Amino acid sequence: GGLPRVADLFEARRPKEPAILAEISGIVSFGKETKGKRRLVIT
DNA sequence: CCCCCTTGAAGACGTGGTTTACGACCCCACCGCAGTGAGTGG
């Protein structure tokens, strides 16, 4: 946007839909299951 | 125009006697934001 966008950028406001990132190198895999949880077990 | 009086009184400063007056005390049968907290359910 404009001024609100700059204000958001300088205040380090987290977006409502953060993108998942690779915390560490390794082969990804799917693990257990829950009501709304999809595991990301990584070797 | 220096000097000591006179001589009559005008005011000058208390002053606490005399006398008000103040102050107080007594009775009255929007805006989005983020941190907090329970509050679960598990």
The reported resolution of this PDB entry, expressed in Å, is 2.5
Which residues, 6+ apart, have CB-to-CB distance to A20 below 8 Å? A40
Would you tell me how many other CB atoms lie within 10 Å of the CB of residue A8?
Answer: 13
Which residues, 6+ apart, have CB-to-CB distance to A2 below 8 Å? none
User: For A5-43, what is the HEC assignment?
Assistant: HHHHHHCCCCCCCCCCCCCCCCCECCCCECCCCECCCEC
Return the structure tokens found at A12. 């380090």
Chain B bases having any atom below 7 Å from a protein CB: 33-34
Obtained via which technique? Answer: cryo-EM
Q: Residues contacting strand B at CB < 7 A?
A: A 11, 13-14
Return the structure tokens found at A16. 């409502």
